[PDB]
């Protein structure tokens, strides 16, 4: 089974104000951590059997242990095993090995001298895949996202609600959506939403770049994708986030480009994993891309990617929410009227609002002030907002 390896996270300490309540909650966290440290330190200290078992098994197998590939199972205790050098050896299977675990192609621990099967290596996970697993959940939560109520609701119905409440889906008869593509202009909150869902989820989370799943050697790309998805299968409730799928999701086309055909083969293996022969199981996929129109139709089609969540440039209410969230830790003055920044049509995104807040803080620091003002925000708006050149036509239209 090998249930999910959910990322560990400390409880959120709120209020975020530098008050005594935050001190008390943080000191409660420190208290419990010290309790855990004391118990885990005095556990092995007071430890006075299985040592005979270890002294027999380890002595019999000996060190070092070679790692080979099982090729054939001839007898109940004899196997043809190929070493990493590609040389096959007819070796013996020692008694202290589960015969049901031995399968062709499995990674098998052999003795160094006689290469006899001393055990089976379970994980044998590519290091480029085990690094995709998330161990420390990101600090961003659903409370750090301003607006985006529809997008958050869709992503929760897709990858969150089925885990907590599969009762609705089972009762009505729907198979819950198992693929979501977060597409929109950059800086709108796609990666932020991925961070938030990773923080909230109780299922294992795999983060991919859409470009680290691509390897030098000819066949290692699709093989790496298959390994990643198999690992996702192992920890049954899983979420596989592939940021910037544009890297491999680009539309298929015919050209010589010996590397591009491997690119397309890798993406073909990806879409086979998403929806092909054999079921995919209880593993959700979240994909993010700035440009969706350049993606291959067979990748973003329903059944492979069930939902296409659009992240538009924030509107007035959403922008006001972003400003309220990102100046929450600030010390605003009384003359500040955030509205003037929220209005007008600068086409500023959530990342733009974050930079506006940061630059207003820097402007206040320039005047040796730890509290921001309206003038600082106004200066920061023009200082940071200068991104696009023209983006507009002339006075043709009345």
């Amino acid at each position: 089974t090998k249930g999910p390896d959910a990322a560990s996270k400390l409880p959120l300490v709120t209020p975020h104000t530098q008050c005594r309540l935050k001190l008390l909650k943080l000191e409660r966290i420190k208290d419990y951590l010290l309790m855990e440290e004391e118990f885990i330190r005095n556990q092995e200290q007071m430890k006075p059997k299985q040592e005979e078992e270890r002294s027999k098994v380890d002595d019999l197998r000996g060190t070092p242990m070679s790692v080979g590939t099982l090729e054939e199972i001839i007898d109940d205790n004899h196997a043809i095993v190929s070493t990493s050098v590609g040389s096959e050896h007819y070796v013996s299977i020692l008694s202290f090995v589960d015969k049901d675990l031995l399968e062709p192609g499995c990674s098998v621990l052999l003795n160094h001298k006689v290469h006899a099967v001393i055990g089976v290596l379970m994980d044998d996970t590519d290091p480029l895949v085990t690094v995709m697993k998330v161990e420390k959940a990101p600090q961003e939560t659903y409370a750090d996202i301003g607006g985006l109520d529809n997008q958050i609701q869709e992503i929760k119905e897709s990858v969150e609600l089925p885990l907590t409440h599969p009762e609705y889906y089972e009762e009505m008869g729907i198979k819950p959506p198992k693929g979501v593509i977060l597409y929109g202009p950059p800086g709108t909150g796609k990666t932020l939403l991925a961070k938030a869902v990773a923080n909230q989820t109780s299922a294992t989370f795999l983060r991919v770049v859409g470009s680290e799943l691509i390897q030098k050697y000819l066949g290692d790309g699709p093989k790496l994708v298959r390994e990643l998805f198999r690992v996702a299968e192992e920890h049954a409730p899983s979420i596989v986030f592939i940021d910037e799928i544009d890297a491999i999701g680009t539309k298929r086309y015919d050209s010589n480009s010996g590397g591009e055909r491997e690119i397309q083969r890798t993406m073909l293996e990806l879409l086979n994993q998403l929806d092909g022969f054999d079921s995919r199981g209880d593993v959700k996929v979240i994909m993010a891309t700035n440009r969706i129109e350049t993606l291959d139709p067979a990748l973003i089609r329903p059944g492979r990617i069930d939902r296409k969540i659009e992240f538009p440039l924030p509107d007035e209410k959403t922008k006001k929410r972003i400003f309220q969230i990102h100046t929450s830790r600030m010390t605003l003055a009384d003359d500040v009227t955030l509205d003037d920044l929220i209005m007008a049509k600068d086409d500023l995104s959530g990342a733009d609002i974050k930079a506006i807040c940061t630059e207003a803080g820097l402007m206040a620091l320039r005047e040796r002030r730890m509290k921001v003002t309206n003038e600082d925000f106004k200066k920061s708006k023009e200082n940071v907002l200068y991104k696009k050149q023209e983006g507009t036509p002339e006075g043709l239209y009345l």
């Binding site: 008050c19 118990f39 556990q43 885990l163 907590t164 889906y169 929450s328």
Partner: protein, 842 residues
């Protein structure tokens, strides 16, 4: 480096500070006047760097000695002001404090907000540094606070004001200083800080907030804090002070929800309506409406709940034609719990005797109790069916019928008191089963009553040498759970005498664990009076001395969050030395029950329990799943369920049993399809062992409780309001489950029905001022505070639109999306009354 203005200001400051070398008359007034002017101008501005303070880096030693010798009048006071402002930036804590202490008073407001905050911090430091050896220094610090607090109140700095007032251990001034627009902020601050502050400051803070809420006439909140304090006199005071009959009805609803039944004098108008609401007679009816809103009138059958059509029938038509007793008991618990409180069942109502006749002894009691537990909160309706089975041929099952009565009267009260009348002539019954059933029914019917007549009637059972050990244990638990959280001296003395007269050989049994139980059940949430309790229990010899001490330590600090008690309990657990591991198990349950008071403490108790599981000895491994069940009752957190699923396949039968019960308790009433599938898989895997199958079917019944409309949470009012009756019920069930084979799998299945004492429903039925149901659009979502200490009601997000009545899962709250109505209680839980808005205009 500096600038032209900066250089000129630095030169001026250096000239002004250097002119103080000699004793010329036109020096001290001019120089100190100029320094005061510049410092006041810079400090009484925005948070810009205090340029005079940056320029000023001199030594005050000459300034301090001249302070000592020159001008005993106001000039030394000016010098004190200047050096205090200078040392606020530096580290001159004691000196910087005493400069404002003895120098020019003037006012702290004249300096600045940052100066006030720094002085507040230094005052707190000094007060913590000052013991009761002298009160001379305390008074001027109090005078400083007299002006510091209003500054914070008027400048929205209630944080620093509250913190300072907690450091000085004096909180009376909040009564006379809190404004209308700021009472909510400070009240929420206190109601959040009470959980983490240790004894005895938490109680003082709670009564301070109680006084504030009484002053501002927020009566429902006053009731909430009164039940937090767990003292009846202030509850009566609030009841008398409630002049609004709608608020009276609301507080009656909350009192019925908490199960607090206080006698009401006839001097209060509408006494009958308040009494009948507090007896909670209406609830079942509303529940019925609830069910007929969800079209879940039709009760279920264990065959469909187990989904036998999906299980791989490896043996078909040859291995399922034999009906063992234990699986029949499990099916009884299922076709009970699942269909409970819906007023109808398709197998126990039309085919009662035929069903019961295939049960033996214990099965008779279990099925008779489940017959009453299939219809909740209908005293007359329940007893109309229970009487015939009370008239049964096998009079031994008569006791079971009493359980039915005790399980039907649970959560309700009648003026004629059918339970007391029915069990008054049966408590003194000589038969062990008869007396057991009588006392259990009386306890379940009268949970939290604390009525003196029933306690006195239960007293002679303890002194009865004839009464068996299990009769004594059930009597002790019933006495404790009738007197939950009261520290009743009568019950305490009776149980102490009973345990003192008990012999070691008779104490060695498992049922003796229930003797401290009631004693502990008398002292829930009151750790102050347990020094005498532990002193009295120290007379008995070990190991049971340590066992009883640990159990009463759990019961005293139920939800207290006292990390020192948890440290003692963890030290007990970590000591690697059968009955010796009982102390470690009780201590593990103690960590659970202490940590469940706070969400942060509970979530760290999760990590501690994981470490205990992966690095503990067998007894700890058995004990932990009960603790995990206690931590997250009716809260199907997926990590907890995953750990329990991992350990349900353990080679230790006790560990697997405890893990299965933890599945049942944590996912109780959530109707989690994932949990249902995992339980079905566990039933398929464990199809051979009768005990594993029995407990997995019990877990399925618990998770399908009320078709997903029932919860066993001992917490209310945004999980802030504890429930003594529910905590008692889970405590009894868990400590009995510390020995699954002898108690749960032995002769004491009826103990499971104690969970029905904790059986509390979830709805959103909305009533008008006349108590008719009123459909109101409600915005329901997670209560994730997107702010800090802004006083917001957690700013409910994840919105969904519903029409009342609504079902709210654990951890998800509700709010009124319509301004047309105003709820008397801002906490939309259970039954509420909405007053029509007078401000709204059509």
């Amino acid at each position: 480096e500096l600038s032209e203005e900066d250089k000129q200001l630095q030169d001026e400051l250096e000239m002004l500070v250097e002119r103080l070398g000699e004793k010329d008359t036109s020096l001290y007034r001019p120089a100190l006047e100029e320094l005061r002017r510049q410092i006041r101008s810079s400090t009484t501005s925005m948070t810009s760097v205090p340029k005079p303070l940056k320029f000023l880096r001199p030594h005050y030693g000459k300034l301090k000695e001249i302070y000592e010798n020159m001008a005993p009048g106001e000039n030394k006071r000016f010098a004190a002001d200047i050096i205090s402002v200078l040392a606020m930036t530096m580290s001159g804590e004691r000196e910087c404090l005493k400069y404002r202490l003895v120098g020019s008073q003037e006012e702290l407001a004249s300096w600045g907000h940052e100066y006030v905050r720094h002085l507040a911090g230094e005052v707190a430091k000094e007060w913590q540094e000052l013991d009761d050896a002298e009160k001379v220094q305390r008074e001027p610090l109090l005078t400083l606070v007299k002006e510091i607090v209003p500054y914070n109140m008027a400048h929205n700095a209630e944080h620093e004001a509250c913190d300072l007032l907690m450091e000085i251990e004096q909180v009376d001034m909040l009564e006379k200083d809190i404004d209308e627009n700021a009472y909510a902020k400070v009240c929420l601050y206190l109601t959040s800080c009470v959980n983490y502050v240790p004894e005895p400051e938490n109680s003082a803070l709670l009564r301070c907030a109680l006084g504030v809420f009484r002053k501002f006439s927020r009566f429902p909140e006053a009731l909430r804090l009164a039940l937090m304090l767990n003292d009846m006199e202030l509850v009566e005071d609030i009841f008398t002070s409630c002049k609004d009959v709608v608020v009276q009805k609301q507080m009656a609803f909350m009192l019925g929800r908490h199960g607090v039944f206080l006698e009401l004098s006839e001097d209060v108008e509408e006494y009958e309506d308040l009494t009948e609401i507090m007896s909670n007679v209406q609830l079942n009816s509303n529940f019925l409406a609830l069910a007929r809103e969800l079209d879940i009138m039709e009760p279920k059958v264990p065959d469909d709940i187990y989904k036998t059509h999906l299980e791989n029938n490896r043996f078909g038509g040859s291995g399922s034609q034999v009906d063992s007793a234990r699986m029949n008991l499990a099916s009884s618990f299922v076709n009970g719990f699942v269909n409970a409180a819906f007023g109808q069942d398709k197998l126990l109502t039309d085919d009662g005797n035929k069903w019961l006749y295939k049960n033996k002894d214990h099965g008779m009691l279990s099925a008779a109790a489940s017959l009453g537990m299939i219809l909740l909160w209908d005293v007359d309706g329940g007893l109309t069916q229970i009487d015939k089975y009370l008239y049964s041929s096998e009079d031994y099952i008569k006791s079971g019928a009493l359980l039915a009565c005790g399980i039907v009267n649970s959560g309700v009260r009648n003026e004629c008191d059918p339970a007391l009348a029915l069990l008054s002539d049966y408590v003194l019954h000589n038969s062990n089963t008869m007396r057991l059933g009588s006392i259990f029914g009386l306890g379940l019917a009268y949970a939290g009553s604390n009525r003196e007549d029933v306690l006195t009637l239960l007293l002679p059972v303890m002194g009865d040498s004839k009464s068996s050990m299990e009769v004594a244990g059930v009597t002790a638990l019933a006495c404790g759970m009738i007197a939950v959280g009261s520290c009743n001296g009568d019950v305490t003395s009776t149980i102490l005498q009973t345990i003192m007269e008990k012999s070691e050989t008779e104490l060695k049994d498992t049922y003796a664990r229930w003797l401290p139980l009631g004693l502990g059940l008398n002292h829930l949430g009151k750790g102050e009076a347990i020094e005498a309790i532990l002193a009295a229990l120290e007379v008995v010899s070990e190991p049971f001395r340590s066992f009883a001490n640990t159990l009463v330590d759990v019961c005293a600090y139920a939800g207290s969050g006292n990390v020192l008690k948890v440290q003692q309990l963890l030290h007990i657990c970590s000591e690697h030395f059968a009955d010796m591991g009982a102390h470690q198990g009780v201590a593990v349950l103690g960590i659970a029950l202490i940590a469940m008071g706070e969400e942060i403490g509970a979530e760290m108790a999760l990590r501690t329990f994981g470490h205990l599981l992966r690095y503990g000895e067998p007894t700890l491994r058995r004990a932990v799943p009960l603790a995990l069940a206690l931590i997250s009752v009716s809260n199907p957190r997926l990590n907890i369920l995953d750990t329990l699923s991992k350990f349900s396949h353990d080679a230790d039968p006790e560990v697997s049993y405890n893990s299965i019960f933890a599945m049942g308790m944590v996912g109780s009433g959530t109707n989690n399809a994932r949990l249902a599938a995992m339980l079905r898989q566990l039933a398929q895997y464990h199809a051979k062992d009768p005990n594993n199958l029995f407990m997995v079917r019990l877990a399925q019944g618990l998770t399908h409780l009320g078709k997903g409309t029932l919860t066993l949470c001992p917490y209310h009012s945004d999980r802030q309001l504890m429930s003594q009756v529910a905590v008692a019920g889970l405590l009894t069930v868990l400590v009995s489950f510390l020995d699954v084979r002898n108690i749960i799998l032995g002769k004491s299945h009826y103990v499971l029905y104690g969970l029905v004492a904790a059986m509390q429903p979830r709805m959103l039925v909305t009533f008008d001022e006349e108590l008719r149901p009123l459909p109101v659009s409600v915005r329901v979502g997670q209560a994730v505070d997107v702010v800090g200490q802004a006083g917001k009601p957690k700013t409910i997000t994840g919105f969904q639109t519903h029409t009342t009545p609504v079902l709210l899962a654990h951890g998800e709250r509700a709010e009124l999306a319509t301004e047309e109505f105003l709820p008397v209680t801002p906490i939309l839980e259970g039954f509420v009354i909405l007053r029509k808005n007078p401000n709204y205009d059509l």
